[PDB]
């Protein structure tokens, strides 16, 4: 993934301020609320009946934390996303059957969450750098589909 030094620094500096578990829970919860077809994978998580029940579901939060923790560690390998996420790509295709469009929807929701969380600090150029990153991750996770 190619980012300028300036873009890379902007990504890392904001990420240093993120509570990965909180943001993970929030982004996965909003994904399931805003694009509810994504709930199809999570019927074992229990009550997803209302926005409040989703956001408060302990299983949703726990998965949010797992997903964003992997995202977070990926931010340390921005020059090698494809090889960093290769095994997870294979897992999501062959065993979990997750349409890669879902990675793109999560990317949109995460950007919205960071804007909500950081307000004016989430400037247009900082957003632009994060748009590259979430596209890059979604592409890296889709790479081994077949």
């Amino acid at each position: 993934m190619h980012l300028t030094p300036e873009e890379k620094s902007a990504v890392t500096a904001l990420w240093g301020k993120v509570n990965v578990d909180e943001v993970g829970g929030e982004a996965l919860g909003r994904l399931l609320v805003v694009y509810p077809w994504t709930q199809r994978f999570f019927e074992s998580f229990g009550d997803l009946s209302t926005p409040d029940a989703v956001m408060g579901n302990p299983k949703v939060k726990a998965h949010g934390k797992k997903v964003l923790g992997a995202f977070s560690d990926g931010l340390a390998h921005l020059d090698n996303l494809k090889g960093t996420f290769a095994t997870l790509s294979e897992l999501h295709c062959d065993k979990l059957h997750v349409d890669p469009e879902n990675f793109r929807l999560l990317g949109k929701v995460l950007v919205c969450v960071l804007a909500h969380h950081f307000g004016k600090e989430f400037t247009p150029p900082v957003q632009a750098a994060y748009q590259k990153v979430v596209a890059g991750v979604a592409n890296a996770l889709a790479h081994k589909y077949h």
């Binding site: 199809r40 349409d99 890669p100 469009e101």
Partner: protein
Amino acid sequence: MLSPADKTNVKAAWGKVGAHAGEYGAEALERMFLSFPTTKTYFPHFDLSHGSAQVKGHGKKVADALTNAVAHVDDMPNALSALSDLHAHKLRVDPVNFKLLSHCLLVTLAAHLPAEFTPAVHASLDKFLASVSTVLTSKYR
């Protein structure tokens, strides 16, 4: 969005499909699975090999639904209501995939209707399949 000329074009082309509608549905699916492999994620319970009877059976159901849409072209939201419910609340197929199957249906019709697939009829069929896709995803959210 479907003008009287569009409706006329769709009925003429689909009428020519006739008793092959099932066979063309199956071929469209096979084109879709090979050209857009991410769509296979919705069918892990199927044998997707060429000639599979699961794929042929599903292609007949898709085609039959389209025949019903053509016959009710002025009342499609009602005629497809139960199918809209099923896709929105149970199958939960991402709306992007409907464009991919629509394209593969168009390619299938082009390959089998040399005389009928004129530019005007192509435009009307594309509009028709976009309307059907819109109806099928209308209750998702």
